[PDB]
Structures are given as C-alpha cells and as structure tokens.
Amino acid sequence: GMKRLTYISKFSRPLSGDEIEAIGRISSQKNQQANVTGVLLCLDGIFFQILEGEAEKIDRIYERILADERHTDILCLKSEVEVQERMFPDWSMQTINLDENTDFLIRPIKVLLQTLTESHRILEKYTQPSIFKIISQGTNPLNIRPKAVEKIVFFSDIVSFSTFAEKLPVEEVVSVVNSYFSVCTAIITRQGGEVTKFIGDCVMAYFDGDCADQAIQASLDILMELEILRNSAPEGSPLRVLYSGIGLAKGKVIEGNIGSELKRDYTILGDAVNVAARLEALTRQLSQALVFSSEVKNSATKSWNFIWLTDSELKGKSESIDIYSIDNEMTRLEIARNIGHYLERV
Amino acid sequence: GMKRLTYISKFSRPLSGDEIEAIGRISSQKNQQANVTGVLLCLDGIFFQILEGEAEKIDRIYERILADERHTDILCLKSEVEVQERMFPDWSMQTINLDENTDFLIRPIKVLLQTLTESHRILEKYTQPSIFKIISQGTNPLNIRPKAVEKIVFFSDIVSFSTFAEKLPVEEVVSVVNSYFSVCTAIITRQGGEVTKFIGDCVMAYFDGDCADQAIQASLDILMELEILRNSAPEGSPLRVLYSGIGLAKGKVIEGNIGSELKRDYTILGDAVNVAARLEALTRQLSQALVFSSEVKNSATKSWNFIWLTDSELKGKSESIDIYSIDNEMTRLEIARNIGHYLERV
Numbered sequence: 083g084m085k086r087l088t089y090i091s092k093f094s095r096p097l098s099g100d101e102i103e104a105i106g107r108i109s110s111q112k113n114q115q116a117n118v119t120g121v122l123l124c125l126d127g128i129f130f131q132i133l134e135g136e137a138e139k140i141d142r143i144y145e146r147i148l149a150d151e152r153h154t155d156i157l158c159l160k161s162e163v164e165v166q167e168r169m170f171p172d173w174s175m176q177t178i179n180l181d182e183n184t185d186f187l188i189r190p191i192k193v194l195l196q197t198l199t200e201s202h203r204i205l206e207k208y209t210q211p212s213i214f215k216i217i218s219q220g221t222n223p224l225n226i227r228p229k230a231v232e233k234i235v236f237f238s239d240i241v242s243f244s245t246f247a248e249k250l251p252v253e254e255v256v257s258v259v260n261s262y263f264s265v266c267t268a269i270i271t272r273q274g275g276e277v278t279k280f281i282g283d284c285v286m287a288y289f290d291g292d293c294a295d296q297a298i299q300a301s302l303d304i305l306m307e308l309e310i311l312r313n314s315a316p317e318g319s320p321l322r323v324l325y326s327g328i329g330l331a332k333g334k335v336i337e338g339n340i341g342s343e344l345k346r347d348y349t350i351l352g353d354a355v356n357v358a359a360r361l362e363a364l365t366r367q368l369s370q371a372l373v374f375s376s377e378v379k380n381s382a383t384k385s386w387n388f389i390w391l392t393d394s395e396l397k398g399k400s401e402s403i404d405i406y407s408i409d410n411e412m413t414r415l416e417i418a419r420n421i422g423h424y425l426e427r428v
Numbered sequence: 429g430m431k432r433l434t435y436i437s438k439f440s441r442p443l444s445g446d447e448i449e450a451i452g453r454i455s456s457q458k459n460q461q462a463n464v465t466g467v468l469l470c471l472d473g474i475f476f477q478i479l480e481g482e483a484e485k486i487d488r489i490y491e492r493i494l495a496d497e498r499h500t501d502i503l504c505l506k507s508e509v510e511v512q513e514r515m516f517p518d519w520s521m522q523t524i525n526l527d528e529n530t531d532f533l534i535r536p537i538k539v540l541l542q543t544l545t546e547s548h549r550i551l552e553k554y555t556q557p558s559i560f561k562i563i564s565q566g567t568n569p570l571n572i573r574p575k576a577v578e579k580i581v582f583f584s585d586i587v588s589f590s591t592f593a594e595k596l597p598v599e600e601v602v603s604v605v606n607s608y609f610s611v612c613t614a615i616i617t618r619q620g621g622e623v624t625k626f627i628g629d630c631v632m633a634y635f636d637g638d639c640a641d642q643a644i645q646a647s648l649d650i651l652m653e654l655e656i657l658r659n660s661a662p663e664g665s666p667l668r669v670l671y672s673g674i675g676l677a678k679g680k681v682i683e684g685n686i687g688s689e690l691k692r693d694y695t696i697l698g699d700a701v702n703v704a705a706r707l708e709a710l711t712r713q714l715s716q717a718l719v720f721s722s723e724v725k726n727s728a729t730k731s732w733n734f735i736w737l738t739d740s741e742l743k744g745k746s747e748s749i750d751i752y753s754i755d756n757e758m759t760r761l762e763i764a765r766n767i768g769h770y771l772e773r774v
C-alpha cells in the first residue's frame with residue numbers, strides 16, 4: 083500500500099541553484115522509475131519534501147536520502163500510511179526553488195514558512211525525542227492508546243550537586259551540568275536507551291525490559307567517560323570533581339496520552355520520585371557508583387562480573403530486594419567533603 | 429521603537445470568505461490610522477498574521493485581537509523587538525485567502541503550511557508553557573543567559589498510586605491520573621504558578637519567591653476540588669479514592685539553556701528528587717495533606733491559620749526546619765488500606 087512522508091532538512095553546505103536543479107532532475111528520473119511522486123522545495127537553506135508511493139519504495143528512497151551528505155537534521159514532520167490517492171500524480175519530483183521566486187503573493191508566504199520552520203526547530207530541542215519516533219511511524223502521539231510495559235529504568239545524579247551551586251557562579255554551574263547531561267544522553271542514546279526527562283540534576287531514562295546488558299554497558303561507559311573527563315580537564319576546572327551515582331531498576335511504565343490540556347507527556351512511571359531517591363541513597367550509603375536490583379541482574383544475558391552488596395527497599399512495598407553492582411576497576415560523605423575543598427579554591 | 433509579531437490561530441467558528449474579506453478590510457482601515465502594516469493569511473481554518481509598527485500600537489492592537497471571539501488558540505510564533513525596517517511598508521493589512529487560491533505553485537505550499545502548522549500544534553502540547561512566554565517577550569529560549577532565582581516549589585502526588593496501577597486496567601489508571609493532572613494544572617496556572625514537569629504521579633510547579641500566598645491558596649483549592657470530585661463521581665468510580673499530598677518548599681532554581689544537543693530544558697532545581705521524596709514522606713508520616721517549610725510560611729503575607737507540626741530535614745544538609753500546615757476543616761498508611769479495598773471491588 084501507499085505511504086506519504088513529509089520532512090524538512092537543513093543544507094549541510096551552501097548549494098547553488100544549479101545544484102538544486104540537478105538534485106530535482108535526478109530525483110525526477112529515479113522516482114519515475116520507482117513510480118514515486120512528490121515535490122521538493124527549498125528556501126534559505128531549508129529543504130521541504132513530500133514523497134508518495136509504495137511503502138516499500140518510499141522507505142528505500144528515504145534511507146538513501148538520509149545518507150545524502152548534502153543535507154542534515156532530517157526531521158520527518160508527518161508519515162501517512164494507508165494513503166488512498168496521490169497528491170502529486172503528475173510530478174515524479176517537482177522542484178520549487180523559493181529563493182529564486184519573486185512572485186507578489188509568495189513573498190509573505192516565504193516569511194511565514196521561514197518563521198514556522200525556525201519556531202519548529204526551537205520546539206524540537208525541548209521535546210522528548212520519543213514523540214518524533216511515534217510521528218515517523220505514522221501515528222499521532224495524542225491518539226495513542228494507553229499501554230503498560232516493563233522497562234529498565236536508569237537514574238543518574240551528580241554527587242554533591244549543591245556544593246557546585248553554592249560555590250560557583252551560575253554560568254559555571256550550568257557549564258558543569260550541561261557537560262554531565264551531554265555525556266549521559268549521548269551514551270544512553272548510543273546504547274539504545276531513551277532519556278525521558280531531567281529531574282533537577284537527575285537523568286531519567288528507559289531501556290527495553292530485556293535490554294539490561296545495554297543499560298549496564300551504558301552505565302559503565304558513563305563512568306569511564308566521566309573519569310576521562312575529570313583527568314583531562316584544565317587545571318582548576320570544576321569538571322575535575324564531577325562524579326555521578328547511577329541506579330537501575332525495573333518498572334512498569336505506562337505509555338499513552340498523559341496530562342492535561344496545558345501540558346502533555348508520553349509516559350508515566352508511578353513513584354519515580356521515590357525510586358530515584360532510594361537509588362541515590364544507596365549509591366551514597368554503599369559508596370558504589372553503580373547499583374541495581376536483582377530484577378535487572380536477572381534480566382541480563384552476558385556474564386557480567388556481578389557482586390552482591392546488600393538488601394534494600396526500592397518500591398514503597400516492604401519487599402526486601404538484593405542490590406548488586408559490577409566488580410571492576412571502575413566501581414572499585416567521602417566525595418562530598420573533597421568537592422567543597424576543591425571548589426573553594428578554584 | 430518598532431515591533432513585529434507573528435502569530436497563528438484557529439477559527440473559533442466557520443467563517444465565510446466574505447467575513448474574512450471584511451476582517452481584512454476593517455483591519456486595513458484601522459491599521460492605516462495607527463501606522464501599522466502587515467499581512468493576514470487564512471488556510472483551512474487557520475489564521476496567520478504578521479503585524480509591524482510602534483511597539484505601543486502593536487501591543488494595543490494585539491490585545492484587541494486576543495479578545496476577538498472569531499478565533500482562538502492564539503500562539504505567537506515570533507516577536508521581534510527593535511525592528512529596523514518594515515517588511516510590508518505598502519500593506520496596512522493585506523489579506524490573502526489561501527482557500528480560494530488555485531495557483532499552480534501555491535498548491536504544494538498550502539499542503540506544506542498545513543502540515544507545519546499541524547505538527548506545530550502537536551509539539552505545543554508536549555512543551556513547557558514557559559518557553560512560549562519567553563518567545564512572546566521577544567527572546568530565543570536557546571539564547572537566554574543563566575540566572576539563579578528563588579522560587580516557591582510545589583510538589584503534589586497521588587496517595588497510594590501503586591494500588592491503582594495494580595488493581596485497574598491501564599485505561600482507567602490513565603483516566604485517573606489525567607483527572608488529577610488536569611485539576612492540579614488548572615488551579616496552579618490560575619493562581620499564577622507554572623507547572624514545569626510531571627515526575628511519575630508527582631506534579632512539580634513553581635511560584636515566584638514572594639508568591640507564597642498564591643501557592644498556599646492553590647494548594648487549598650486543589651484539596652477542595654479533589655474533595656468535590658471524590659463526592660460527586662459515579663458510584664464505583666476510582667475517582668472516589670483519589671487523594672493527594674502537597675508539599676511546598678523554597679528553592680534556588682537555575683533558569684537557562686540546560687541540557688544537551690538531544691534534549692533541552694529551561695530550568696533546573698538541583699536535588700528536586702530528594703526534596704519531593706522528603707515532602708511525600710512528611711505528608712504520609714503526619715497524615716497531613718499539606719505541609720510546607722518555615723521559609724514558605726515566612727514568605728506569606730496573609731493571616732493564614734498556620735499550625736506548627738514537627739521538625740524535618742528537606743535538603744540533604746543536616747539543618748532541622750520547622751514544618752507547618754494550615755489548620756482548617758480540609759487538612760483536619762490510613763488511606764492506603766482503604767484504597768485497595770475499594771478498588772478491589774469496582
């Protein structure tokens with residue numbers, strides 16, 4: 083059946099009007115051979131494209147388009163599955179270069195398009211990466227039916243964050259937290275997790291319920307990167323005393339259209355506050371940078387060097403759960419007093 | 429000096445092409461008298477408008493436009509202060525009805541505009557209301573300089589949320605949490621607070637540091653509305669056993685461009701996790717639906733019926749703070765066992 087994608091992208095490099103003409107002419111030739119139709123517009127370094135045709139052919143062309151080095155920041159705004167008729171039946175690929183168009187009525191429209199796209203790019207930064215994935219799969223996020231799914235939940239925090247905020251100017255605190263968040267988000271994403279929110283200095287993320295190995299690997303990689311960061315920072319850098327505690331648990335997450343008219347969310351983990359606070363307490367109490375429950379340990383498939391540490395309570399239920407870590411050089415209140423002294427004289 | 433606003437809105441009711449023509453012609457006449465210029469476009473029940481002129485005149489016209497009943501859901505996409513020249517010097521108000529336009533090149537552009545606007549409306553639901561306010565004030569949220577500001581922080585949660593998730597189908601859990609979030613968000617917003625995030629079943633919100641009375645009033649109103657909700661729900665409704673604990677504290681919030689390339693936030697309250705967990709523990713330990721610190725109590729100006737309850741620790745620092753509530757009929761583990769029995773047989 084027929085599929086129609088709409089996406090926007092950014093010129094990765096300046097492109098002349100003749101290069102854009104060539105892109106359109108090659109696309110028209112290739113699309114004609116594939117029975118694909120659509121339209122390509124450019125304006126001030128932005129591409130807009132609509133492609134329609136057999137789902138199979140569309141997905142293969144779009145993969146090729148994703149790899150084309152001449153644009154970047156590809157965002158699919160809309161994916162329509164089960165499309166009934168073509169919008170552009172006579173256009174294998176029609177190319178409309180708006181930079182070159184001087185028509186009277188199109189001038190205000192170009193301003194509007196530019197403004198909508200730019201506002202769209204701002205909003206893209208402040209939205210959960212996971213809404214865009216639902217869109218790309220062809221569903222309106224506001225119309226998802228609720229579902230409960232087991233996840234591995236990741237929480238990490240900054241040791242003695244309050245000391246940073248007390249001892250450094252706000253711009254330096256923000257530089258520290260942004261380095262932290264950048265390290266965590268990059269590694270979690272590369273291991274297939276999704277960061278769902280920042281709660282103060284705490285990063286909250288999900289992994290699929292059978293992806294314990296990926297969650298553990300991501301945790302170890304974060305610890306290794308922070309060690310590299312502390313060692314390699316300039317003399318006197320506040321980054322030298324950036325440490326993190328990480329906890330992993332298993333939870334039942336609800337996915338759906340959650341919230342109010344004023345604010346929506348895609349997912350809810352009930353009592354997230356309490357699980358995170360209990361895991362931060364464990365990492366301090368055990369002086370262990372990584373702790374996780376037996377449920378996480380039992381969902382793993384690789385032969386990790388597990389070490390049993392203690393019993394604890396993670397959910398408000400009075401169930402006593404075994405807490406494990408990984409026994410390696412990395413993982414092998416203390417840090418808080420060191421933090422303050424160092425930050426005092428930098 | 430000169431200001432230029434761009435906004436989109438939705439037809440509140442169907443409007444004929446002649447009514448849109450009349451809006452444009454009255455606007456052109458009024459704007460000419462005010463030395464304001466711009467353009468108005470409509471497409472499939474959406475208005476787009478750009479207005480430019482003296483900041484003073486622009487703000488007064490825009491107020492009038494906000495009150496016009498013929499459209500709703502006004503969203504300012506861009507506000508430019510210190511505008512150097514006019515984009516539409518010869519158009520007091522030019523009206524472009526895109527529904528009526530059959531031009532060859534404009535047809536794909538209408539599709540694109542529709543898709544950008546619709547995707548924009550989805551993203552609007554999932555974004556902090558506060559980014560839109562920064563935009564309306566004429567600043568790019570990604571370019572704000574970091575600032576530390578004292579706030580009253582509000583945390584509320586659902587008593588025994590886990591029992592709902594254990595005993596009810598997921599669609600009913602979502603209906604319960606959405607009723608909760610809707611009540612909280614409406615009342616906090618009406619009292620001038622901003623909801624910044626949902627953390628599981630916990631609502632996190634800010635009030636200005638000298639707006640303790642508004643935070644306390646909002647808390648009391650939420651408790652009163654939940655009581656009305658429990659009493660007025662259908663027989664057997666899970667809403668009959670929806671209860672909330674609320675805690676208020678004072679904190680130093682950092683506002684700025686926080687996060688990573690993959691995910692941004694506007695504000696960070698360090699150790700938010702720990703303050704919220706400690707306040708939920710207080711509401712259960714004291715069997716009091718509303719607790720707040722002495723700092724909140726001392727920031728209030730009205731003659732509230734304060735009652736001292738206990739000492740507690742809210743920040744990880746070993747400082748012992750007096751905890752207060754309000755002594756009234758409303759505010760005057762217990763509920764958890766009742767919850768489970770009721771939900772068991774509904």
Ligand SMILES: Cc1cc2nc3c(=O)[nH]c(=O)nc-3n(C[C@H](O)[C@H](O)[C@H](O)COP(=O)(O)O)c2cc1C
Nearest residue numbers: 105108109112113129131143146147150152153175
């Ligand atoms: C904005 C943009 C849109 C494109 N659209 C199409 C298209 O619709 N169809 C197509 O075959 N190639 C399109 N291309 C080019 C592909 O990325 C690729 O370069 C081209 O199809 C050559 O593919 P090949 O590796 O099979 O030779 C587009 C490229 C860009 C930058």
Ligand SMILES: Cc1cc2nc3c(=O)[nH]c(=O)nc-3n(C[C@H](O)[C@H](O)[C@H](O)COP(=O)(O)O)c2cc1C
Nearest residue numbers: 451454455458459475477489492493496498499521
């Ligand atoms: C989409 C839309 C755009 C409007 N734009 C303008 C405008 O640019 N200038 C203006 O004076 N009135 C504009 N109006 C109408 C005002 O809302 C208001 O009805 C009109 O200015 C009459 O104002 P009055 O109360 O002073 O008579 C617009 C109305 C709508 C629905």
Ligand SMILES: [Ca+2]
Nearest residue numbers: 239240243283
């Ligand atoms: Ca912390």
Ligand SMILES: [Ca+2]
Nearest residue numbers: 393402403404
């Ligand atoms: Ca045990």
Ligand SMILES: [Ca+2]
Nearest residue numbers: 585586589629
């Ligand atoms: Ca709770």
Ligand SMILES: [Ca+2]
Nearest residue numbers: 739748749750
């Ligand atoms: Ca005391």
